[model samples]
Target: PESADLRALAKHLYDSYIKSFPLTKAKARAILTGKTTDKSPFVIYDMNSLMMGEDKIQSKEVAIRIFQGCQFRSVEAVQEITEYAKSIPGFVNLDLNDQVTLLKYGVHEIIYTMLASLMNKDGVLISEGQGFMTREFLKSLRKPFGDFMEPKFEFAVKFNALELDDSDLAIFIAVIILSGDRPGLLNVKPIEDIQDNLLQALELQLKLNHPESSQLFAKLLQKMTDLRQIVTEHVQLLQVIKKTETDMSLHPLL
Candidate 1:
């Protein structure tokens, strides 16, 4: 019965913040299918030529641009998700260090997972819905960085096919952020317990909401596993980029 109560609380928390962000399927779909002439909120600028452009990028600039774009999107998302996490009842009750640690490791995973929501089989939308960069174009960016993004793109293509709504995504993100397995956590058990409750609520909600689809919940769980592996690779790739390109400045929060 206590578990049931926690589930109820989790559901309420999920509902409260599901609409907090402006990200919407309509926006993603607009970016995906909108006419070529439409203006986007984001525009990519050349660090060398110093102007808005696309496609004809330098190889070395690939990591810098990718970092800049993801960091641009990620900083906003970090604050948004951080606020959302603080709103959850027990999340703020954890040790301050643990809270920071969770966000430190977990935010990237959530960012990448959320990125998948804005994607399709073709590619992801960049620059605040203004640019639709293709998969092939992304691969052309540079070594390791381009290669690093491939698994994420492949997973996203499959995950987006599941067609989860914003509500499903909100709870799933909660599950990701509350994970106990991240390195350097001082207290794993309590965090694990919270994650377990969120998972229960998420799976139950998915089942109730998608009654016609028997495997939807399982498939979503599988995507989370894939997300973890891809993030591990991404971190490794970032380390390599940081070493090889010492001049590039990474996002402060990242």
Candidate 2:
């Protein structure tokens, strides 16, 4: 495709992505802070309050209640991401198992990258922009959970410094999801072709759009490796939590 076509395709990806996850960081902050001047129905479990209080999960009992609370957004994103992927050519067209294969391996990295949307120096916002879960709260959790979440928070705060908008996020996520290193990929060439296009589009879009930051592309590429490391460590931590936390129940999908 021509340079113009790639740039245009990137814009199209941005629109589809925003439809799936419309709440950006700025809007999330505004709603949380009441800068938007809107109101909603209230209840404690799934409440109307703008700012959610700290979990104060000092005990295992308390942690179980909200341990799966955050997972709701994750599950929702996976569904929406699949829908978004279907809208892209050469993706939903692939074999069913191959589609599942990509998401199984890639979604964690994709989620953590997009986590920057609700994240800042202090903490992350959760529940689809309805609540702020503090770094303090996450830090207070038991060993493996605490250990796993800290690196993501560290990655997020630094990632926000890159100042990417939702458009950039669209291409980055496609790049992450369409990655070819997934363990059981069957239709390899088609997958890489799509990824190659996304990577080409990513560079062209970034260079064309942010001409001043000569190294911005390079910096973002390095960050992908950082995310890869974090995700791998997170998997290790999951095993520790599994073997050690005998009394606890966890999210089924985890």
Candidate 3:
């Protein structure tokens, strides 16, 4: 009946519903009136009552409900991509857990799209039953598309320091672990083992330069020295990962 921001509403509902039980003679008004900001009431409502409700209305709904869904070309390009994208709906029903999965996969998609575009000069579309992923294909493609066609800078921007923090460590670890298995992917062997070694070296450099934290000092000052090296290596890995995802997305049908 009343209008309030969701946080305020949650707070009011929390106080009025629970605190009235043992703490106050005033049944409803006192708690609702903001006499207390203690979140104990909210905790109970959260733990017991909220769980009793409709499964907490998933964070996925919260995140994407505000935006419209994407519309792709709808062409199958053959059959496999059409089937996979068709069957999955590109993460429409993802819960928070599913959202996390979607994010990692989404990054894979972004990387691959860019890589495929780089490898194939005609902008990464699969035609007939063939894809241009070879050196000759790249060369031919580049000639038509002109010299301006470059490996996308998106990887440099999106997969920066902040992304490294938010991106699930598991995804990175999985890529590292799977590198040995996915030999079909191009240009991964040289930088694979030495990938994180730069970060490790940076950490070692920091330890060598400065004393350990006395009271929770930020290691960032030391850590950032590795950013340049990490980024250089990341460019190579980005190409590999991009290529890997594209290869995975392709099907024999197209």
Candidate 4:
């Protein structure tokens, strides 16, 4: 507070987030209103897929194809997130290894957080909200892959209840990337300072954005802690898959 201008920093983060991740609902609204002129092909999700009596995704081959498509999207979205971090103030000045480490460990957390934008109770919006990837679809996947979407659904449901806008999420995502407690960080001091400042920025932003809510700041911190467990469990499961199976290919960046 004394050394740095928190308000300016908050504004910067807000603007940065807005530029990087377009609001999911706002874009969807344009599509719903028949306003978007862009003609990207829509991925069609059929009602027959969800009906209990007649399932379209019955065979193992279809499930793998669906899951692979999901994996590709995960990589695509992650590349977007990594670029978002490069625009953060002073992030580029950090040691190269430190930058890589932050993104490596923090990527999953951000990926899961971003999932909130595309999710609802029964399904997640896939193919730019053109299609639905439902719980029934995810349930048909294999062990660790099947294990993935459930925790994310639980997280996204609770996250949506917080009602954070893109601005709040921007600083929050920065907080996750510049985490002080990550083990591999070499430039720990500056990393911690940046994260601490972002935490303060988030608290101040929340004060204005969520004035009625009790413990919104603290609850957001707990959500970060929850995010850690989510990523850790996912990595552990992946390690097992890597050693025991050759069928599924993990993205090199992962």
Q: Which candidate should be chosen as best, given TM-score against the real structure?
A: 2
Top lDDT prediction, candidate number? 2
lDDT of 3 by residue, 1-254 (tens): 22223224223323432222122213122233346563212211222432442332222331122111111221221122322222222223433343333332333343333232222212221221122112322333323232212333333333222222111221222222222223223344433443334234333333433454341113332322223234344455444323212234544574
Worst 10 residues of 4 by lDDT: 52-61
lDDT tens readout by residue for model 2, 20-81:
77676566555656556666212233232323444321343545445444555678789888
Give the clash count for each candidate.
2, 1, 2, 0
Better of 1 and 2 by lDDT: 2
Model 3 sits at a Cα RMSD from the real structure of 24.9
Question: For candidate 3, what is the lDDT?
Answer: 0.28
After TM-score superposition, the amount by which residue 106's alpha carbon in candidate 2 deviates from its true location, in angstroms, is: 0.9
Higher-ranked by TM-score: 1 or 3: 1
Which stretches of model 4 miss by more than 4 angstroms?
A: 1-5, 23-60, 142-145, 240-254
Weakest lDDT window of 10 consecutive positions for candidate 2: 41-50
Residue 37 in model 3: lDDT: 60
Write down the lDDT of every candidate, Cα atoms only. 0.70, 0.71, 0.28, 0.70
TM-score against native, each model? 0.77, 0.80, 0.18, 0.78
| Candidate that beats the other on lDDT, 3 or 4, i.e. the better one | 4
TM-score of 1: 0.77
Model 4 TM-score, 2 decimals = 0.78
**Candidate 1 lDDT score relative to the true structure:** 0.70
Which parts of model 1 are misplaced by more than 4 Å? 1-11, 14-20, 30-63, 243-254
lDDT of model number 4:
0.70
lDDT of 1 by residue, 1-254 (tens): 56557556756775666555666654676656655456553433334322444543334454566666577778888888878888876888899899988888777778777788777786676655656556775676666566756776877777777788776776878887787877887987779888877877887778776788778987676766776787666667666656345565776674
